């Protein structure tokens, strides 16, 4: 099987600056009537893959002449000379010479933008849930920037890693930040037998981890 | 209009086998092959196979999991998949395609849920702060939407009113069943002093929930 790498996996530009994608295959992707079967494929979020280059370098009709690809052997490029709106999404590299046909894993292109710290809410659990027999406490953590974010959580001062489940939002279309909502799910016993609940998150934004508690006496 | 038309999605249990359609109209049916390919949630694409009158290849793979079929003289292809688990779940796409010509246009994608799951209906549970938010000029509020299958579920607010500062977030999958949540960030002017209400809906299980977040 060709394995297809691409880099980077992600990759952050501002509008109207130039990207470059590189992909590599594990062997050459000669095809043995001499061709060269490598195609670029760009999918936005809920849409099919949609073909840009095809034959290493050839654009596909209706592709605008900022995107360019090139390379040989096992070695390829696509290029993008000015970024635009529309370009952001999933770039696949393809190989189609040897069977099994393969794709790289993609690369993630993002709008580059000012750091943001995250606002942090923490929400304990609802007295209507309690009833129930369940304890959820959530934390969100909105509009920061960029995407790398440590969350953590303590009961009564120490770490806890089992039963938390953490939910991303991608890169919001407005103002190009992410968000993310943190929950920690109890049984109502276990929930009663703890005081302080701890929502932490560490972010580039601030030397001092960003914190949020409570106590369940409050 | 070359145009390439699948399937609906598809809701299974484990074990059990599906069959999805990939319809072609706007060109001669028997000049192009058709390749099915999957994509399974934040991965790349993985080829199953193609077919084509006179050629049906399979990915190694999936070889004992997938049956393709051609019916020429209604110009439609059919994948059969079977055995099915839920590491089974992706979207399935079926594209167009030869050497010379690559893959030009594509379906729509075809959605595929295995889960032993049955229809249930959400918990909504409303998420209001209690009293480190009072002082401030934006309060955050929330929705907690949990235990439910399948998906969707919609949220809203104020029924639809309330659009800005708005972040709903994809569910994830625990013991079976999906929880999601949304936060809502609205001027401590005018709440509680206004009403802020939280809507679901959930169709599967033809059930609408209203939430209003009161303090506590």
């Known amino acids: 099987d060709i394995l297809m790498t691409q880099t980077p996996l992600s990759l952050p530009v501002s509008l109207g600056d130039q990207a470059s994608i590189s992909c590599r295959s594990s062997?050459?992707?000669?095809?043995?009537?001499?061709?060269?079967?490598l195609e670029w494929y760009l999918q936005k979020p809920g849409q099919s893959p949609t073909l840009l280059i095809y034959?290493?370098?050839n654009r596909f009709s209706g592709v605008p002449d900022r995107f360019s690809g090139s390379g040989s052997g096992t070695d390829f490029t696509l290029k993008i000379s000015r970024v635009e709106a529309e370009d952001l999404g999933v770039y696949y590299c393809?190989?189609?010479?040897?069977?099994?046909?393969?794709f790289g894993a993609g690369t993630k292109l993002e709008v580059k933008r000012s750091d943001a710290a995250p606002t942090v809410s923490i929400f304990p659990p609802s007295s209507e849930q309690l009833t129930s027999g369940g304890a959820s406490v959530v934390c969100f953590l909105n509009n920061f920037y960029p995407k790398d974010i440590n969350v953590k959580w303590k009961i009564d001062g120490s770490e806890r890693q089992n039963g938390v489940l953490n939910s991303w939002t991608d890169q919001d279309s407005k103002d190009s930040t992410y968000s993310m909502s943190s929950t920690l799910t109890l049984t109502k016993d276990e929930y009663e037998r703890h005081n302080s609940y701890t929502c932490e998150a560490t972010h580039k934004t601030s030397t001092s981890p960003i914190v949020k508690s409570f106590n369940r006496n409050e | 209009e070359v145009q390439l038309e699948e399937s609906g999605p598809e809701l299974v249990k484990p074990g059990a086998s599906v069959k999805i359609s990939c319809k072609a109209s706007?060109?001669?049916?028997?000049?192009?092959?058709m390749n099915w390919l999957r994509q399974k949630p934040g991965q790349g694409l993985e080829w199953i196979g193609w077919?084509?009158?006179?050629?049906?290849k399979y990915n190694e793979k999936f070889k004992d999991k997938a049956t393709l079929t051609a019916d020429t003289s209604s110009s439609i292809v059919y994948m059969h998949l079977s055995s099915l688990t839920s590491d089974d779940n992706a979207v399935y796409f079926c594209?167009?395609?030869?050497?010379?010509?690559?893959?030009?246009?594509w379906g729509e994608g075809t959605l595929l849920t295995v889960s032993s799951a049955k229809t249930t209906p959400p918990s909504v549970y409303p998420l209001a702060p209690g009293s480190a938010a009072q002082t401030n000029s934006m309060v955050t509020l929330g929705c907690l939407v949990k235990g439910y299958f399948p998906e969707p579920v919609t949220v809203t607010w104020n029924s639809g009113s309330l659009s800005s500062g708005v972040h709903t977030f994809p569910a994830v999958l625990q013991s079976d069943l999906y929880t999601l949540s949304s936060s809502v960030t609205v001027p401590s002017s005018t709440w509680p002093s206004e009403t802020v209400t939280c809507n679901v809906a959930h169709p599967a299980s033809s059930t609408k929930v209203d939430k209003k977040i009161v303090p506590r």
């Open positions: 594209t167009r395609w030869t050497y010379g010509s690559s893959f030009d246009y």
């Open positions: 706007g060109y001669t049916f028997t000049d192009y092959y």
């Open positions: 077919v084509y009158p006179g050629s049906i």
């Open positions: 062997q050459s992707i000669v095809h043995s009537n001499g061709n060269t079967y």
């Open positions: 034959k290493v370098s």
């Open positions: 393809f190989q189609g010479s040897h069977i099994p046909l393969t």
